[PDB]
From a paper:
The apo-Pl-scyllo-IDH structure was refined at 1.75 Å, and the other complex structures ranged from 1.8–2.3 Å, depending on the substrate. This molecule formed hydrogen bonds with Y135, Y165, E195, and H318, which were the same residues used for substrate binding, other than the three catalytic residues, which suggests that these 4 residues may only be required for substrate binding, although the role of H318 remains unclear.
The enzyme, therefore, turned out to be scyllo-inositol dehydrogenase with L-glucose dehydrogenase activity (P. laeviglucosivorans scyllo-inositol dehydrogenase; Pl-scyllo-IDH). Further analysis showed that the enzyme oxidized L-glucose to L-glucono-1,5-lactone as the first step in the pathway for L-glucose metabolism. Pl-scyllo-IDH formed a homo-tetrameric structure in the asymmetric unit, and this structure was considered the biologically relevant form, since a similar unit has been observed for myo-IDH from B. subtilis and GFOR from Zymmomonas mobilis.
Author numbering:
A (entry chain D), B (entry chain C): 6 to 373
C (entry chain A): 6 to 372
D (entry chain B): 7 to 372
């Protein structure tokens, strides 16, 4: 039978989830999910967006969305603030959960959520857009197949400039409670999701951070920016391999520059999300023709064929979310494991909070 | 009330239209179109895809679908010259038409369609989806605004390699009777759609063409390839301005390389569809910083903000079709003109056929 | 004995020749050419630049440089209108000639020079330095080896913007009588040298052209620009293969964008001179890894190893000229034929002037 | 005219020779006199003296450095002879152009730095990546406030000349006789660029690895003692952060010295494999906002001496002609050359500090 969907939130990621749920069966076949309940505030906004998004109804009561008998799975995309409350309420109501990163603002809340998930017998997945591109998934498979030999180094970054303007006003997100981590939270967690998928688990971090714009306008006065604008870290993976890692929300000229490369004993892979349809692969070759290959995204890569049969017809950012919906759909059907669930996700939260601790204490942080 | 939709065909473009119709209101607001009837063959396939696409019913008879009283607009997406009969039948039934290229194989048939469209007083649009990218629409606006001065030269190409391998079998597409034009028909029409939107109408062409792989495998023997693998032409626009134009279905390594540039008296614009989120702009600057700008697609560009609030989250090929659906939707409502209708579309047919004729005769062809 | 060198001109290409002759033996071995006489105007400039360039003396009289007993080879880098006179004089005096393109202002003059060169039994080479990069030369070898299969299309361009500003003053270079061709002369000839080296001889052209800025400032008033700012042409090669060709001196944002592509039945090669150290090669590959390769210039490519042992240490524009000098030195010594000599070069002049005629008359031109 | 001595004729040796030959061609003044070339064996010194245009070849570098017709000495030999040759030149009253490194050990470099000040001669270290018109233009742009205040540096120097595990073991792979690995071959160059952009390094925390631990030797295997790759987090004297790496086993990279400076009002980005491009972002109106590709041309320092028209790509070897000119002008008292043995010592301290941090697992302060 068709999956009954509830959606909480309609912003950047809320509407992304909505577009995804709308076309998951168009792309992948099977039964179209039923868009049952959309929750958002104010109520008039929830009603108007429910209409245009195609949800059977809208409400300002998020608990209605998680408890409706016709709902099987809940997409949660509202402020990180109430993620634990909403996710745990949905699991308690017997609903599968698609939770936008982060799990919660602290490791402690994430730990409790992880335990609730294991008790509920429902499927969970954390929204990690950037692990779903055909280019990224192709890279993981190429590494798995030995295309670059043994990985010997990872270098990744995630630069954007959405906070570079110092006139941008203060908000609750720039506080430790209310907001949690800064660039590490909004960007770093995404890079960690990609990094651990490529290199395996993180064994140790040593990090440094900075707040470049330390105070911002707050209507007459100013208030202090409490979380980091940028951070960098050196990594040791559980394999013993090295890594470099960074993120920034003040890196002028960058808009979605999640970029990484894996250097191996027999090749190199390189990617930049601002050009998400290109994957660069070097493997040793005859001297006359030796050099990096530009692999342009097409049907040979995971997921792409469900969207288009011809290569070079660029896959979009939003289609990453359709792929993510499908993974959850199949996991609910018992036809495939979804990653990361709340257990896998908690590890990612531990890593990013470990980097924040390292930057503050000046000490390396180790993981089991 | 919401627009009632009929869809004919389910391949490359059929699925693309279906995804567009499903998310058009999600992206742009208003009422979601009602997916009423899907027509395809065989019947079991029409029924299977109606279910997964979310259409109320499938049918093996398209004539049924176009006359359904619950239908207001008909998407015609067969990868075929066989569009005249379906297009005119829809218009005759008082339905608006979203037609995939070409209008027909012959200019004569396209001309009949153009007249039926005017007589019908229903809206029409041809699926020239490469005119819908935020980057392309931004370029047109920059030109209109005087950002590069007066255009002095156009250079465009559309290379792909889907027929490059001589091993690839013969098919009816390679006949003049059933396939019509070659590269000019498959790819050239698209380049013309973009070119004339940038530079204005074509006054004259002088062209060359080649069939470089003259025979292909066919049922244990070979059959002759009757249309062109590639073609090039020098253009004069009605403006008096010069142009260069090419297309190829045998250009090894290229997958969707619709690439163009407009050189003006005060700057230059350059674009490549394989990187559809980048627009290159040169305008004179102080010597120390002078150079082309990489304009990364974001909410400053037409259409983008309906899909994502943050720049650099790559807009995709399929989202062009959502934009196209919205343009038609607004034209139906009487709140904008959709381009190109069958009148504008006919001109495109005349141009590609004029290029083909010029290549065959070795003489220039005039259009005005 | 070391080659005795005369140099006429000290501008863009004159100084490029001077730097090349100075280090040709440093790169390639053998005896360093002797820099004997530098000719330039005015005399004070010739003396000054001779000193800094390392030439034994400078003179204001090009005839002195050509006739000097210690001179064996003459580099001619002066205005196109004097090329025939200077080249013929050098040949008549028994000197080998390195002549900057073009040969002359007319096909008629180029023919006379071609005849004079054969009459003389001295070596000649025309200075088409874009045929000298390791990337270009590697591409020619890859095509010969079958790396892209059978070539089926050529597409080339040469955009620059040195004349894009309409306030840039008029000069005699912009008349047909004294300046000759416009963009076709300054840029087109370079693209032809590359194009024919890749694709073989041209059989036919059909061209269009424009002068975008028809009048320019001249000493408070205005004067007419008589030659083209841009031109485009469709090509048929002697092989039967198709081509696209263009040039422009008004293409805003481009500085040395000589760019070309050869598409073949088993691959594609693509190049852009603004990134002269990269050659793009597509060949079929398994679907998981299929794509163009970025071949970064290194010691695997012709000429590079004479300048650097390590790949990725970018080869420079000026080092193309060092390669060109060595080709001439080896030709003079009987150890290699240099291309293009005045005979090969005459064909290039015929092609560029045929394009100009085609654009003027609106008719194709056959060769 | 400057009397030139040249010691060594391999990669850098020829590069120096080509530079000395064209330095006056490009920049004017008097062509330096190519007096004595020293190398071994004797036949090679004479052969190359002839093709390089030096008045004579010799197998004894000591006689070349003490020659009265010599004013300046280019030293391009193996790292293990740099101290001896450099101090001998300075003691003979000759100016010195020295290829990196100053020496294998910081202790030796310090002694060299002492001798340099006491000799009153000019010294320059061959950090040629600081000589490109693009790099020099970047420094000037930062000085004009084009990107505001620098807030982060990220740099790398990847190459793959040791990536093939079948490449034989050599003395260069010994701590004793090769010194540092990737940090010495590549790291030093990245430091020269980094401090030129960001000022002095205050602190580093580093990691390193030997990826290929054993290599074929005579009958077989011998252990590799120095690092194939290293990374570090940087704190500059300014307080600004940095990321730093180098590798000799990064497959596909040939000369990927790449750096980026992010500031409060813009970003600059560069990659030596495309040394004629400098990427600059500054905020712009929404419709046209984005990075600019600045193609190297006569607006950039040094370029016009080589070509009057932009986009005619400046090459690696021309960086060395620029370096030669800077030394010449320093000798003539018309401009100070960087880095001298004093500035050079600081660079040795940083790279060795990074090596120490990686070995001990502790940050190192300067």
């Amino acid at each position: 039978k068709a999956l009954g969907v509830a959606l909480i939130g309609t912003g950047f990621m809320g509407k992304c989830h909505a577009m995804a749920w709308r076309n998951v069966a168009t792309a992948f076949g099977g039964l179209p999910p039923r868009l049952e309940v959309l929750a958002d505030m104010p109520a008039d906004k929830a009603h108007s967006l429910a209409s245009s998004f195609g949800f059977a109804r809208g409400t300002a009561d998020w608990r209605e969305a998680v408890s409706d008998p016709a709902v099987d799975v809940v997409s949660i995309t509202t402020p990180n603030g109430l993620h634990r409350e909403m996710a745990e309420a949905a699991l308690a109501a017997g609903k599968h959960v698609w939770l936008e990163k982060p799990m919660a603002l602290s490791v402690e809340d994430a730990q409790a959520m992880e335990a609730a998930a294991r008790a509920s017998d429902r499927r969970t997945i954390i929204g990690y857009n950037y692990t779903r591109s055909p280019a990224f998934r192709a890279a993981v498979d190429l590494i798995a197949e030995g295309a670059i030999g043994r990985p010997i180094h990872f270098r990744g970054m995630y630069d954007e400039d959405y906070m570079a303007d110092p006139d941008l006003p203060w908000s609750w997100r720039l506080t430790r409670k209310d907001g949690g981590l800064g660039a590490l939270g909004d960007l770093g967690c995404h890079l960690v999701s990609v990094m651990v998928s490529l290199m395996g688990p993180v064994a140790r971090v040593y990090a440094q951070a900075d707040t470049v714009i330390t105070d911002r306008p707050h209507q007459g006065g100013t208030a202090r920016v409490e979380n980091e604008d940028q951070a960098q870290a050196l990594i040791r993976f559980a394999s013993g391999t090295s890594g470099e890692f960074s993120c920034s929300r003040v890196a002028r000229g960058y808009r979605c520059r999640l970029a990484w490369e894996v250097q191996g004993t027999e090749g190199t892979l390189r990617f930049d999300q601002e050009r998400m349809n290109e994957l660069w692969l070097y493997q040793p070759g005859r001297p006359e023709i030796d050099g990096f290959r530009r692999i342009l995204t097409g049907p040979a890569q995971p997921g792409f064929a469900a969207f288009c049969p011809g290569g070079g017809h660029n896959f979009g950012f939003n289609e990453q979310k359709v792929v993510e919906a499908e993974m959850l759909r199949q996991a609910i059907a018992g036809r495939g494991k979804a990653w990361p669930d709340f257990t896998d996700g908690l590890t990612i939260e531990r890593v990013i909070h470990g980097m924040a601790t390292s930057a503050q204490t000046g000490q390396p942080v180790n993981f089991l």
